[PDB]
mmCIF file of C-alpha atoms and ligand atoms in Angstrom:
data_model
loop_
_atom_site.group_PDB
_atom_site.id
_atom_site.type_symbol
_atom_site.label_atom_id
_atom_site.label_comp_id
_atom_site.label_asym_id
_atom_site.label_seq_id
_atom_site.Cartn_x
_atom_site.Cartn_y
_atom_site.Cartn_z
ATOM 1 C CA UNK A 1 -0.175 8.235 19.436
ATOM 2 C CA UNK A 2 -2.855 8.986 22.046
ATOM 3 C CA UNK A 3 -3.608 5.452 23.211
ATOM 4 C CA UNK A 4 -7.000 4.301 24.466
ATOM 5 C CA UNK A 5 -5.653 4.186 28.025
ATOM 6 C CA UNK A 6 -4.449 7.784 27.720
ATOM 7 C CA UNK A 7 -7.875 8.923 26.508
ATOM 8 C CA UNK A 8 -9.325 7.065 29.502
ATOM 9 C CA UNK A 9 -6.988 8.878 31.913
ATOM 10 C CA UNK A 10 -7.984 12.293 30.549
ATOM 11 C CA UNK A 11 -11.695 11.448 30.754
ATOM 12 C CA UNK A 12 -11.393 10.463 34.425
ATOM 13 C CA UNK A 13 -9.436 13.585 35.382
ATOM 14 C CA UNK A 14 -11.913 15.849 33.583
ATOM 15 C CA UNK A 15 -14.812 14.212 35.423
ATOM 16 C CA UNK A 16 -12.928 14.284 38.735
ATOM 17 C CA UNK A 17 -12.345 18.031 38.371
ATOM 18 C CA UNK A 18 -15.959 18.715 37.385
ATOM 19 C CA UNK A 19 -17.125 16.804 40.470
ATOM 20 C CA UNK A 20 -14.764 18.691 42.820
ATOM 21 C CA UNK A 21 -14.866 22.262 41.422
ATOM 22 C CA UNK A 22 -18.091 24.271 41.734
ATOM 23 C CA UNK A 23 -17.888 27.335 39.431
ATOM 24 C CA UNK A 24 -21.040 28.771 41.028
ATOM 25 C CA UNK A 25 -19.150 29.212 44.339
ATOM 26 C CA UNK A 26 -22.391 28.712 46.276
ATOM 27 C CA UNK A 27 -20.669 27.175 49.318
ATOM 28 C CA UNK A 28 -18.792 30.439 49.986
ATOM 29 C CA UNK A 29 -21.838 31.603 51.968
ATOM 30 C CA UNK A 30 -20.984 29.030 54.658
ATOM 31 C CA UNK A 31 -17.565 30.540 55.397
ATOM 32 C CA UNK A 32 -16.950 33.047 58.146
ATOM 33 C CA UNK A 33 -17.655 36.414 56.512
ATOM 34 C CA UNK A 34 -14.860 38.465 54.943
ATOM 35 C CA UNK A 35 -14.015 41.626 56.862
ATOM 36 C CA UNK A 36 -12.034 44.313 55.027
ATOM 37 C CA UNK A 37 -10.981 46.910 57.600
ATOM 38 C CA UNK A 38 -5.695 42.732 63.030
ATOM 39 C CA UNK A 39 -5.631 40.140 60.213
ATOM 40 C CA UNK A 40 -9.304 40.768 59.469
ATOM 41 C CA UNK A 41 -9.354 38.331 56.519
ATOM 42 C CA UNK A 42 -7.793 35.337 58.304
ATOM 43 C CA UNK A 43 -11.102 33.666 59.351
ATOM 44 C CA UNK A 44 -12.644 33.857 55.873
ATOM 45 C CA UNK A 45 -9.445 32.812 54.094
ATOM 46 C CA UNK A 46 -8.876 29.987 56.587
ATOM 47 C CA UNK A 47 -12.329 28.593 55.783
ATOM 48 C CA UNK A 48 -11.744 29.094 52.049
ATOM 49 C CA UNK A 49 -8.427 27.217 52.170
ATOM 50 C CA UNK A 50 -9.885 24.486 54.388
ATOM 51 C CA UNK A 51 -12.785 24.056 51.951
ATOM 52 C CA UNK A 52 -10.362 23.732 49.048
ATOM 53 C CA UNK A 53 -8.153 21.172 50.806
ATOM 54 C CA UNK A 54 -11.269 18.979 50.961
ATOM 55 C CA UNK A 55 -11.836 19.479 47.230
ATOM 56 C CA UNK A 56 -8.181 18.682 46.491
ATOM 57 C CA UNK A 57 -8.450 15.419 48.443
ATOM 58 C CA UNK A 58 -11.551 14.431 46.478
ATOM 59 C CA UNK A 59 -9.733 15.065 43.203
ATOM 60 C CA UNK A 60 -6.595 13.199 44.295
ATOM 61 C CA UNK A 61 -8.588 10.078 45.223
ATOM 62 C CA UNK A 62 -9.766 9.816 41.597
ATOM 63 C CA UNK A 63 -6.294 10.040 39.995
ATOM 64 C CA UNK A 64 -5.622 6.752 38.131
ATOM 65 C CA UNK A 65 -3.178 4.772 40.266
ATOM 66 C CA UNK A 66 -3.263 7.021 43.346
ATOM 67 C CA UNK A 67 -5.140 4.505 45.511
ATOM 68 C CA UNK A 68 -2.569 1.817 44.639
ATOM 69 C CA UNK A 69 -0.253 3.599 47.101
ATOM 70 C CA UNK A 70 -0.088 3.009 50.832
ATOM 71 C CA UNK A 71 -2.071 5.262 53.152
ATOM 72 C CA UNK A 72 1.180 6.767 54.448
ATOM 73 C CA UNK A 73 2.294 7.748 50.939
ATOM 74 C CA UNK A 74 -1.121 9.201 50.073
ATOM 75 C CA UNK A 75 -0.885 11.390 53.176
ATOM 76 C CA UNK A 76 2.667 12.574 52.466
ATOM 77 C CA UNK A 77 1.730 13.468 48.887
ATOM 78 C CA UNK A 78 -1.366 15.450 49.848
ATOM 79 C CA UNK A 79 0.264 17.208 52.816
ATOM 80 C CA UNK A 80 3.106 18.436 50.590
ATOM 81 C CA UNK A 81 1.054 19.210 47.480
ATOM 82 C CA UNK A 82 -2.138 20.732 48.943
ATOM 83 C CA UNK A 83 -0.975 24.359 48.859
ATOM 84 C CA UNK A 84 0.400 23.899 45.333
ATOM 85 C CA UNK A 85 -2.804 22.353 43.971
ATOM 86 C CA UNK A 86 -4.797 25.186 45.555
ATOM 87 C CA UNK A 87 -2.591 27.691 43.727
ATOM 88 C CA UNK A 88 -3.159 25.815 40.453
ATOM 89 C CA UNK A 89 -6.919 25.333 40.788
ATOM 90 C CA UNK A 90 -7.457 28.939 41.908
ATOM 91 C CA UNK A 91 -6.214 30.027 38.464
ATOM 92 C CA UNK A 92 -9.669 29.180 37.088
ATOM 93 C CA UNK A 93 -11.139 32.196 38.917
ATOM 94 C CA UNK A 94 -8.117 34.486 38.489
ATOM 95 C CA UNK A 95 -8.669 37.456 36.178
ATOM 96 C CA UNK A 96 -5.983 39.474 34.429
ATOM 97 C CA UNK A 97 -8.423 42.384 34.092
ATOM 98 C CA UNK A 98 -7.442 43.437 37.624
ATOM 99 C CA UNK A 99 -5.202 40.660 39.074
ATOM 100 C CA UNK A 100 -7.941 39.281 41.319
ATOM 101 C CA UNK A 101 -9.636 35.968 42.075
ATOM 102 C CA UNK A 102 -13.236 36.597 40.983
ATOM 103 C CA UNK A 103 -15.524 34.039 42.641
ATOM 104 C CA UNK A 104 -18.894 35.431 41.564
ATOM 105 C CA UNK A 105 -19.536 38.398 43.865
ATOM 106 C CA UNK A 106 -17.899 41.471 45.368
ATOM 107 C CA UNK A 107 -17.539 39.879 48.809
ATOM 108 C CA UNK A 108 -15.780 36.978 47.055
ATOM 109 C CA UNK A 109 -13.503 38.951 44.716
ATOM 110 C CA UNK A 110 -10.063 38.658 46.307
ATOM 111 C CA UNK A 111 -6.972 40.737 45.578
ATOM 112 C CA UNK A 112 -3.464 41.222 46.970
ATOM 113 C CA UNK A 113 -4.747 43.257 49.928
ATOM 114 C CA UNK A 114 -6.943 40.358 51.067
ATOM 115 C CA UNK A 115 -3.918 38.041 51.186
ATOM 116 C CA UNK A 116 -2.051 40.645 53.239
ATOM 117 C CA UNK A 117 -5.027 40.920 55.613
ATOM 118 C CA UNK A 118 -4.515 37.198 56.291
ATOM 119 C CA UNK A 119 -0.948 37.811 57.510
ATOM 120 C CA UNK A 120 1.150 37.184 54.390
ATOM 121 C CA UNK A 121 3.837 39.451 52.928
ATOM 122 C CA UNK A 122 5.104 40.372 49.463
ATOM 123 C CA UNK A 123 7.751 37.639 49.784
ATOM 124 C CA UNK A 124 4.863 35.310 48.887
ATOM 125 C CA UNK A 125 2.314 37.605 47.227
ATOM 126 C CA UNK A 126 4.579 38.969 44.477
ATOM 127 C CA UNK A 127 5.731 35.528 43.214
ATOM 128 C CA UNK A 128 2.141 34.316 43.643
ATOM 129 C CA UNK A 129 0.721 36.955 41.290
ATOM 130 C CA UNK A 130 3.515 36.359 38.769
ATOM 131 C CA UNK A 131 2.667 32.649 38.906
ATOM 132 C CA UNK A 132 -1.059 33.220 38.346
ATOM 133 C CA UNK A 133 -0.316 35.511 35.395
ATOM 134 C CA UNK A 134 2.186 33.128 33.812
ATOM 135 C CA UNK A 135 -0.178 30.179 34.213
ATOM 136 C CA UNK A 136 -3.104 32.108 32.717
ATOM 137 C CA UNK A 137 -0.946 33.132 29.745
ATOM 138 C CA UNK A 138 -0.450 29.442 28.936
ATOM 139 C CA UNK A 139 -4.157 29.191 27.984
ATOM 140 C CA UNK A 140 -4.217 25.538 28.994
ATOM 141 C CA UNK A 141 -6.923 23.261 27.726
ATOM 142 C CA UNK A 142 -9.013 21.903 30.578
ATOM 143 C CA UNK A 143 -7.364 18.566 29.766
ATOM 144 C CA UNK A 144 -3.926 20.071 30.433
ATOM 145 C CA UNK A 145 -5.178 21.881 33.549
ATOM 146 C CA UNK A 146 -6.350 18.672 35.227
ATOM 147 C CA UNK A 147 -3.302 16.685 34.074
ATOM 148 C CA UNK A 148 -0.991 19.261 35.669
ATOM 149 C CA UNK A 149 -2.838 19.104 38.992
ATOM 150 C CA UNK A 150 -2.560 15.301 39.028
ATOM 151 C CA UNK A 151 1.166 15.308 38.203
ATOM 152 C CA UNK A 152 1.764 17.859 40.984
ATOM 153 C CA UNK A 153 0.102 15.555 43.520
ATOM 154 C CA UNK A 154 1.927 12.359 42.528
ATOM 155 C CA UNK A 155 5.535 13.557 42.805
ATOM 156 C CA UNK A 156 8.155 11.021 43.967
ATOM 157 C CA UNK A 157 10.624 13.565 45.411
ATOM 158 C CA UNK A 158 8.352 14.773 48.214
ATOM 159 C CA UNK A 159 9.959 14.379 51.664
ATOM 160 C CA UNK A 160 8.732 11.347 53.570
ATOM 161 C CA UNK A 161 7.787 9.230 50.543
ATOM 162 C CA UNK A 162 8.302 5.517 51.180
ATOM 163 C CA UNK A 163 7.666 3.831 47.806
ATOM 164 C CA UNK A 164 9.175 6.536 45.614
ATOM 165 C CA UNK A 165 9.511 3.981 42.809
ATOM 166 C CA UNK A 166 5.745 3.413 42.703
ATOM 167 C CA UNK A 167 4.992 7.148 42.890
ATOM 168 C CA UNK A 168 7.294 7.734 39.914
ATOM 169 C CA UNK A 169 5.617 4.995 37.866
ATOM 170 C CA UNK A 170 2.194 6.556 38.468
ATOM 171 C CA UNK A 171 3.413 10.057 37.593
ATOM 172 C CA UNK A 172 5.129 8.711 34.469
ATOM 173 C CA UNK A 173 1.807 7.391 33.160
ATOM 174 C CA UNK A 174 0.421 10.900 33.689
ATOM 175 C CA UNK A 175 3.443 12.746 32.274
ATOM 176 C CA UNK A 176 3.452 10.645 29.098
ATOM 177 C CA UNK A 177 -0.301 11.221 28.780
ATOM 178 C CA UNK A 178 0.230 14.988 28.977
ATOM 179 C CA UNK A 179 3.224 14.984 26.619
ATOM 180 C CA UNK A 180 1.296 12.950 24.046
ATOM 181 C CA UNK A 181 -1.848 15.064 24.482
ATOM 182 C CA UNK A 182 0.038 18.255 23.635
ATOM 183 C CA UNK A 183 1.632 16.570 20.566
ATOM 184 C CA UNK A 184 -1.754 15.406 19.213
ATOM 185 C CA UNK A 185 -4.435 17.880 20.332
ATOM 186 C CA UNK A 186 -2.819 21.257 21.081
ATOM 187 C CA UNK A 187 -2.336 23.089 17.772
ATOM 188 C CA UNK A 188 0.673 25.350 17.220
ATOM 189 C CA UNK A 189 1.784 27.972 18.073
ATOM 190 C CA UNK A 190 0.180 27.398 21.482
ATOM 191 C CA UNK A 191 1.896 23.990 21.827
ATOM 192 C CA UNK A 192 5.441 25.367 21.489
ATOM 193 C CA UNK A 193 7.526 24.126 24.442
ATOM 194 C CA UNK A 194 4.243 23.740 26.329
ATOM 195 C CA UNK A 195 5.267 20.672 28.349
ATOM 196 C CA UNK A 196 8.519 22.321 29.447
ATOM 197 C CA UNK A 197 6.583 25.460 30.396
ATOM 198 C CA UNK A 198 4.179 23.387 32.497
ATOM 199 C CA UNK A 199 7.066 21.615 34.242
ATOM 200 C CA UNK A 200 8.574 25.033 34.996
ATOM 201 C CA UNK A 201 5.305 25.926 36.731
ATOM 202 C CA UNK A 202 5.718 22.859 38.955
ATOM 203 C CA UNK A 203 9.170 24.155 39.900
ATOM 204 C CA UNK A 204 7.686 27.590 40.614
ATOM 205 C CA UNK A 205 5.205 25.854 42.922
ATOM 206 C CA UNK A 206 7.991 24.269 44.984
ATOM 207 C CA UNK A 207 9.383 27.734 45.738
ATOM 208 C CA UNK A 208 5.907 29.098 46.499
ATOM 209 C CA UNK A 209 5.328 26.072 48.743
ATOM 210 C CA UNK A 210 8.481 26.865 50.727
ATOM 211 C CA UNK A 211 7.656 30.547 51.215
ATOM 212 C CA UNK A 212 4.060 29.824 52.230
ATOM 213 C CA UNK A 213 5.160 27.209 54.774
ATOM 214 C CA UNK A 214 7.667 29.729 56.145
ATOM 215 C CA UNK A 215 5.039 32.438 56.608
ATOM 216 C CA UNK A 216 2.470 29.883 57.786
ATOM 217 C CA UNK A 217 4.856 28.627 60.474
ATOM 218 C CA UNK A 218 5.449 32.169 61.741
ATOM 219 C CA UNK A 219 1.741 33.044 61.661
ATOM 220 C CA UNK A 220 0.601 29.798 63.304
ATOM 221 C CA UNK A 221 3.248 30.094 66.041
ATOM 222 C CA UNK A 222 1.155 32.811 67.687
ATOM 223 C CA UNK A 223 -1.780 31.049 69.417
ATOM 224 C CA UNK A 224 -4.127 33.967 68.702
ATOM 225 C CA UNK A 225 -3.630 33.195 65.000
ATOM 226 C CA UNK A 226 -3.868 29.399 65.277
ATOM 227 C CA UNK A 227 -7.204 29.896 67.052
ATOM 228 C CA UNK A 228 -8.702 31.277 63.823
ATOM 229 C CA UNK A 229 -7.560 28.364 61.644
ATOM 230 C CA UNK A 230 -9.546 25.177 61.087
ATOM 231 C CA UNK A 231 -8.709 21.684 62.388
ATOM 232 C CA UNK A 232 -8.063 20.424 58.853
ATOM 233 C CA UNK A 233 -5.696 23.318 58.095
ATOM 234 C CA UNK A 234 -3.719 22.575 61.265
ATOM 235 C CA UNK A 235 -3.489 18.891 60.339
ATOM 236 C CA UNK A 236 -2.432 19.473 56.731
ATOM 237 C CA UNK A 237 -0.306 22.624 56.952
ATOM 238 C CA UNK A 238 1.023 22.016 60.478
ATOM 239 C CA UNK A 239 0.313 22.887 64.099
ATOM 240 C CA UNK B 1 -1.490 11.262 63.396
ATOM 241 C CA UNK B 2 -3.564 12.601 60.482
ATOM 242 C CA UNK B 3 -7.059 11.264 61.272
ATOM 243 C CA UNK B 4 -8.990 13.880 59.282
ATOM 244 C CA UNK B 5 -6.831 13.446 56.173
ATOM 245 C CA UNK B 6 -7.072 9.668 56.632
ATOM 246 C CA UNK B 7 -10.870 9.753 56.881
ATOM 247 C CA UNK B 8 -11.208 11.941 53.781
ATOM 248 C CA UNK B 9 -8.919 9.553 51.872
ATOM 249 C CA UNK B 10 -10.998 6.490 52.836
HETATM 250 C C1 LIG C 301 -8.115 34.430 48.488
HETATM 251 C C2 LIG C 301 -6.763 35.090 48.336
HETATM 252 C C3 LIG C 301 -6.193 34.443 47.107
HETATM 253 SI SI1 LIG C 301 -5.814 32.634 47.480
HETATM 254 C C4 LIG C 301 -4.416 32.215 46.266
HETATM 255 C C5 LIG C 301 -4.395 30.737 45.944
HETATM 256 C C6 LIG C 301 -3.508 30.031 46.949
HETATM 257 C C7 LIG C 301 -7.323 31.567 46.992
HETATM 258 C C8 LIG C 301 -8.248 31.993 46.076
HETATM 259 C C9 LIG C 301 -9.336 31.218 45.695
HETATM 260 C C10 LIG C 301 -9.473 29.983 46.268
HETATM 261 O O1 LIG C 301 -10.536 29.102 45.991
HETATM 262 C C11 LIG C 301 -11.281 29.215 44.835
HETATM 263 C C12 LIG C 301 -11.672 27.866 44.266
HETATM 264 O O2 LIG C 301 -10.505 27.309 43.871
HETATM 265 C C13 LIG C 301 -12.402 26.865 45.185
HETATM 266 C C14 LIG C 301 -13.634 26.308 44.466
HETATM 267 C C15 LIG C 301 -13.905 24.793 44.599
HETATM 268 O O3 LIG C 301 -12.959 24.031 44.729
HETATM 269 O O4 LIG C 301 -15.062 24.321 44.535
HETATM 270 C C16 LIG C 301 -8.548 29.567 47.197
HETATM 271 C C17 LIG C 301 -8.697 28.213 47.829
HETATM 272 C C18 LIG C 301 -7.468 30.335 47.551
HETATM 273 C C19 LIG C 301 -5.133 32.346 49.267
HETATM 274 C C20 LIG C 301 -5.923 32.179 50.381
HETATM 275 C C21 LIG C 301 -5.336 31.982 51.638
HETATM 276 C C22 LIG C 301 -3.981 31.924 51.792
HETATM 277 O O5 LIG C 301 -3.355 31.740 53.032
HETATM 278 C C23 LIG C 301 -4.026 31.069 54.017
HETATM 279 C C24 LIG C 301 -3.106 30.834 55.214
HETATM 280 O O6 LIG C 301 -1.781 30.609 54.922
HETATM 281 C C25 LIG C 301 -3.169 32.019 56.147
HETATM 282 C C26 LIG C 301 -2.502 31.658 57.455
HETATM 283 C C27 LIG C 301 -3.637 29.585 55.873
HETATM 284 C C28 LIG C 301 -5.142 29.640 55.948
HETATM 285 C C29 LIG C 301 -3.196 32.109 50.683
HETATM 286 C C30 LIG C 301 -1.687 32.088 50.789
HETATM 287 C C31 LIG C 301 -3.780 32.312 49.435
#
């Protein structure tokens, strides 16, 4: 059932993730320092997000079929998916011991109060925590984790897509790979309705995307706040 | 329009 091409796809996505995710979190020392005291966490979290957008781009470039698209379509897909892929990939450091993102040290252990000290409200933070918990409870294999990130990126219904037919064909190769992987390698009971549960998480991400863009647009409208963002964040999330 | 995204996608 799991064809040789499908095993190839999984191998590439695993390697792409390993080359774009550093579980030592050593680069966090280059960010502007976190200040927990005003939006005191905006500079650190802006650098953290900007750093992760770069990692998301590096992963997306290695998705089988992604570079067959036009440059315009690659840009639309990454602009619309970046915040969602960051939410997905940040689950690797999320802990249910205390509902925090543990990135190796106390300075880099982030909770709900750090998100609020970047300007965001419970309208986003509450559904964000529920999403992180529900995704962690799925206990995805690393193979399913990287497949879900790739499917999120290559979605044909994103606004501004030109060749939606080509985007769908690429995602279909990935969706069938995931569906077959669950039916051959994920033992029950963990596999029960697992594909449908993962597709529900993509729907949850669309709603989280909308609320983040809403709060981002209000935060970035004040020039004092935009001044603390990075050039890449302004290009991807909006100016 | 998106020169930094474009360059990282190169
Ligand atoms: C930190 C608080 C929890 Si966050 C939840 C996840 C989205 C998070 C946690 C860990 C993490 O990175 C860890 C590895 O994944 C990278 C390792 C690697 O790739 O090597 C990242 C990237 C994000 C977060 C941060 C900033 C936010 O807002 C920013 C603005 O909207 C504020 C105007 C725009 C700047 C939001 C809404 C959420």
